[PDB]
Each structure stands twice: as structure tokens, then as C-alpha cells.
């Protein structure tokens, strides 16, 4: 059936994982029958700003390879004026797809994923990137590890079928930090990613993001910035987890906990 050549290396297409804006992802095999994911981007009719954002995303992905194995591997790539191919490490399943099909998450699993997420995001912060759009879909489960897939630089959407890609009703403000919303009139910092990570852990803890129940988007944004609107933190066995969540979801980012401090938190450091 179909092949893709990248830097002269031939890859046969096992299957298509999804589509995007003008994008496709495929599971492929090399000549030794080792599996990879190839992202294809059609550059035809794409503007400098999008090109530049992909160029910049690739440069960062490329550079940060060496710094953390909680970043998706970029084995190789090919860029012309007409297209991009990126040869990347293939995963098992994204975190959102995984969480959506899980009844309840094992406490140990949750903690372990939490550590992976902190480390990946810590890495990008150390190279001056604030992602600013973190959600479960930005993480891929690989060998039982979470790996960050993108840096929020590229104007890309993670792979899905035709109906989802053309669905105007996807794109949540459920993970959006208060300081971004008050920005609207640079409030965004590494603390913004802490809030979003906090919403992911909260989800993995209580089965919903903090404001998921507010269905009107404008109402939801109103609740996110409203200090008087209390976030519920139901008592749970893991008191360290409960604390983490309270520390990540402080509306004032100066009061909000940082990543280096999350990495020294009991929830992360003390076992059983
Ligand atoms: Cl895309
Ligand atoms: Cl629990």
C-alpha cells in the first residue's frame, strides 16, 4: 500500500491516526519494521505566521530532545515549501482519550502521570517556553509514561476524524487560567501552565475539571475570574493531593504555587 519517504528513508503506512487543519498523522513502519508516527502538514496556502510557528515549534522540539525524555522524540523531519513531514515516536493513546474511557484512575498511576507532566513542563519553562494551552490531549502515553506532544507554539490540532476536525464546538475554556481572561482588554507566565496542570490533576482526582458543570461559556469565564466563586475540594484520602490541587488553583498567580515547588511537594516526593 502507501509509503512515505523522509530524508530518503522509506516508511510504509500502517494506518492513519487522524487529520488536522491541513494535517495528517500516520502509524508507519521503517525497513526494520519499527513503528513511528509521521505528522504530515500540507503547507500549500499557509501563511508566514503559521509557517513560522511550525518552524519555531520544530526548532524547540528539536533542541529540547536532549533535555527530557518526557518530551516526545523527533527522530527526523523534512521541510519543503509544499509540506512538512515529521518522524516522531509513536504512542499508545493520548491522555484525554484514556481518561474519557477510564472508570476511575489508580492513585499510583495518577501520581506517576503527574510527575511526568511536571517534568515535561518544567523542561520547557527552563528554555523560556510557556505552553499556555495545556490539556489532557497534549500528553501521550508511551511505555507507561506521559510525554508532552507540543509546546503550544505551532498552530496545530492533535489528530482526529473528519467530524471532530470540522467541529466548531470543540475547544474548551475549562483549562484557562484567570489571568489570561483578565489579560483581555502580558499576564501569562509559567504560573499559567500550573493552573492548567492543576485542572488536569483535579480532573484525574474528582472526575471533572473545576468549572466543567457551568455549561454557558461566558458564565464559565465569569466563574474562573470570580474570587467569590469557591472551587470545591471534596475531602479525599490523599490529603497531599488535595493540597496540591488547592495550591495550583489559586486565582492570583503570585499566590499560585510554582513548578520547582510542586517538584518538592509531599504528593510528588513521599511514597505510599
Ligand atoms: Cl494542524
Ligand atoms: Cl481519590
Numbering used by the authors: 515 to 699, 709 to 795
According to the publication:
Monopolar spindle 1 (Mps1) is a dual‐specificity protein kinase, orchestrating faithful chromosome segregation during mitosis. Mps1 acts as a master conductor of SAC signaling by phosphorylating various kinetochore components. The Mps1 kinase domain adopts the canonical kinase architecture with an N‐terminal lobe connected with a hinge loop to the C‐terminal lobe that contains the catalytic loop, the activation loop, and the P + 1 loop. All reported structures of the Mps1 kinase adopt the hallmarks of an inactive conformation, which includes a mostly disordered activation loop.
To investigate whether the MDS region is interfering with the kinase domain structurally, we then crystallized Mps1400‐808 in the presence of ATP. The crystal structure was determined by molecular replacement, at 2.4 Å resolution. However, the electron density did not show any likely placement for the MDS region, suggesting it is either very flexible or degraded during crystallization. Notably, neither ATP nor its hydrolysis product ADP was observed in the ATP binding pocket. To our surprise however, while inspecting the structure we noticed that unambiguous density was present for residues 670‐685, the activation loop of the Mps1 kinase. The activation loop has a random coil structure except residues 677‐680 that form a single helical turn. It should be noted that the observed conformation of the activation loop is stabilized by crystallographic contacts. However, the observed conformation of the loop, which is affected by crystal contacts, blocks access to the ATP binding pocket, and the kinase remains in the inactive conformation. The conserved acidic residue, Glu 571 in the αC helix, does not form a salt bridge with the catalytic Lys 553, which in turn stabilizes the ATP binding; instead, the backbone nitrogen atoms of activation loop residues, Phe 665, Ile 667, and Ala 668 make a hydrogen bonding network with Glu 571. In the current structure, the hydrophobic R‐spine is disassembled, also suggesting that our structure is in an inactive conformation.
